[PDB]
Structure formats: C-alpha cells, structure tokens
Design a protein around this ligand. Structure first.
Ligand SMILES: Nc1ncnc2c1ncn2[C@@H]1O[C@H](COP(=O)(O)OP(=O)(O)NP(=O)(O)O)[C@@H](O)[C@H]1O
Ligand SMILES: [Mg+2]
Ligand SMILES: [Mg+2]
Lengths: 20, 336
C-alpha cells in the first residue's frame, strides 16, 4: 500500500527547511 | 472582511515602518528545556522571572546565520513577526540580541506540533482536517493582503494551543513582496512546481502548499514523497497525484484545484482570489466568522498538566548557549 511505502521511507520524521 | 483587513493593514504598516527593538535581555529568563530544532535555530521553553510566565524563545547563532546566508531572511522574520497580529499567528513578545545570538521570545503554545499528533494518530478525518484548513485559509488571506508570502507551510510549523486551535510559527521564509521573487526555499514535500523550476513566483505557492497540507492531513502521508529530495522534486513537477479510496469527491475536487501545476488555473490565484476556496463545497459547512472568533468546538484538545508542561513535545539533546566576549556580525544585524 502507499501507506506502507511511506512508513518504510526515510522521510517520516520531522522535515527541516532547505538550506544551501 | 474587505472592511476588517483594511484596518489591520494600517496597524501592520506602522509597525513595519518603525520596528520594535531590544525589548528584553537574556538575564530576565530562566532557560528550561528545548522544545524543538530546525535547520536554522533552536527553540527553548523559558520562564520570565518578573512575571512568572512561560515563553518559547527562538535562538539564532549569528555566525551560523551568515554561513547559511540567511541574513536577509532572518531580518525579514523578526521585522514581519513583530508587525503582525492575528488569532492563528504566534505572538512575538520580546526580541533582543547579544554578542553571539539573536533572540525572539514568543508565546508558548503547549499543545505541541500538529506533526506529532498527525503521525501518532495516523491521519485526521475530513471534518477534523477541515477545521485546521479553515484557519490556514483565513491566515493566508490576512497575510497575502499585507503583501506577505509565508513559504514554509508544514505540520512541523503548526502548533496546537490549549483550545485546540492552530498557531502558525516559523516566519523564517516570510517575505513582503509586491510582484515576484526567486529564492529557492521551503521544505521539499511542500515546494510548488514553479519554485523548483526556478521561474519566479508569487503568493500562489502558499495555496499550493495548502493543497499538500490538506492532503497530508487527510491521507496521513504527503502527495509526493521519496527518500531523497531530488526524487521528490521529480514527482512534484510531473503533477501526477493519486487519491486514497477514502477521500470524498468534494475533497478530491478541491485538491485538484489547489495542486494545479498551471498558475492560471490554481485556486487562490484567480479573479475571485480566496473566495474560490471559501465557496468550495468542501467548506460548505464551514462558518468562517465562527472559526475566526474561536467559537467553534475543536475536534481535538491536547492534554496539558499545568503551565511549563512540555509533555506534548519530543526530547532533544540540550546544548549550552554560548555568548562570546567579542561582538559578532554587529553591522549585519544592526536593525535587529
Ligand atoms: N511559540 C512556540 N511554542 C512552542 N513551540 C515552538 C514555538 N515556536 C517554535 N516552536 C517549536 O520549535 C520548532 C522550531 O522552531 P522554528 O522557528 O521552526 O526553527 P526553524 O529553524 O526555523 N525550523 P525549520 O526552518 O523548518 O527547519 C518548531 O517546529 C516547534 O516544535
Ligand atoms: Mg520550522
Ligand atoms: Mg524556519
């Protein structure tokens, strides 16, 4: 499922803003 | 509405022209616990000695700011935050600086980030998501009318208060601009196509981000996700979106008009402006004046045991705040 693929991804935690 | 906003703009303009400065000092506070971190700063729970009140203090290392080239952005953050006044916007109480850091003392929103509750529960039912969404719609209406663009909408920047209402924080990318701007900034999952494509954009990006927010709240995961940002950007640009079986027809229709890659067709960026969104069927049961007045009964109220309770926030590694004996970047932050 899409949910299962998300939960297994590396971006399920807090997401910081883009800094260069 | 047309009447109200016009009067709030006058208030904003006076403070925008002559900003408040040095309204407190580090020694007036007892530093307690770190509430959160980000790419730029750290936010600490502090207690004001004279009054006994708790606040959330954002600490910015001046040197780190320059290294990351956020000088202009940081100045915008403070200038804009001290000038705004809205029910769903965190309030800036004091601001000051010392040899090494920049400080912004805000009202403490004890309910925690919407992010944590969203992840724990899995997802919000439509009526629950609508409740939060309605507040953001009004917030963007207020912000845009002042020529402001938010640029960093995400559950991590949204706090739940004691009454269960939203408090928008982090104005790190907020900017006052009439016309277009080009900075590539925001959070991967919430970037509008036009930002990634480097073509110059306007307030319409905030409306796209609302689309992503509503989608994430209702589904429990963002519309575009992957392991690396670059992979995400590819998905965002394609524009292909898939909806979960449980999404109602109204919701799907609203999202298709917000997650519209074409600016000439994106809701919020048309002739009727914000009205296209407010008058959409998904919001048919929403009493806009009632939300603004906080008269609506929130679908979720976080547990809160006394002031100073941080049980709704994760734990972070504490770090000593250091203040050099020499002034750092004095000229760069003169107006702060
Ligand atoms: N007024 C507040 N009350 C309680 N917690 C807060 C408040 N303001 C911020 N926080 C918490 O502190 C975190 C970081 O604050 P923030 O202003 O977002 O720093 P940041 O570096 O700009 N984050 P980002 O740019 O998204 O990577 C938030 O995500 C909240 O968890
Ligand atoms: Mg943030
Ligand atoms: Mg930020």
């Amino acid at each position: 499922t899409t949910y299962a693929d998300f939960i297994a991804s590396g971006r399920t935690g807090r997401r910081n803003a883009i800094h260069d | 509405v047309k009447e109200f906003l016009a009067k709030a703009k006058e208030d904003f303009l006076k403070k925008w022209e002559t900003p408040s400065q040095n309204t407190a000092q580090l020694d007036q506070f007892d530093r307690i616990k770190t509430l959160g971190t980000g790419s730029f700063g750290r936010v600490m729970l502090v207690k004001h000695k004279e009054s006994g009140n708790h606040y959330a203090m954002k600490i910015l290392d001046k040197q780190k700011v320059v290294k990351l080239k956020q000088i202009e952005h940081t100045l915008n953050e403070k200038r804009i935050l001290q000038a705004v006044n809205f029910p769903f916007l965190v309030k800036l109480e004091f601001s000051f600086k010392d040899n090494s850091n920049l400080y912004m003392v805000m009202e403490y929103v004890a309910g925690g980030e919407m992010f944590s509750h969203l992840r724990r529960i899995g997802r919000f039912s439509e009526p629950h998501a609508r409740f939060y969404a309605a507040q953001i719609v009004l917030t963007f209406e207020y912000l845009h009318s002042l020529d402001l663009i938010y640029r960093d909408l995400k559950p991590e920047n949204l706090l739940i208060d004691q009454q269960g209402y939203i408090q928008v924080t982090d104005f790190g990318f907020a900017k006052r601009v009439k016309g277009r701007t080009w900075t590539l900034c925001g959070t991967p999952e919430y970037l509008a196509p036009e930002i990634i494509l480097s073509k110059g954009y306007n307030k319409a990006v905030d409306w796209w981000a609302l689309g992503v927010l509503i989608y994430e709240m209702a589904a429990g995961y963002p519309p575009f996700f992957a392991d690396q940002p670059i992979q995400i950007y590819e998905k965002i640009v394609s524009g292909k979106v898939r909806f979960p079986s449980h999404f109602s027809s109204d919701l799907k229709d609203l999202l298709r008009n917000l997650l519209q890659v074409d600016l000439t067709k994106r809701f919020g960026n048309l002739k009727n402006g914000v009205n296209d969104i407010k008058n959409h069927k998904w919001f048919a049961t929403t009493d806009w004046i009632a939300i603004y007045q906080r008269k609506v009964e929130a679908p979720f109220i976080p547990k809160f045991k006394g002031p100073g309770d941080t049980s709704n926030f994760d734990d972070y590694e504490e770090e000593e705040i250091r203040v050099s004996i020499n002034e750092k970047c004095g000229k760069e932050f003169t107006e702060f």
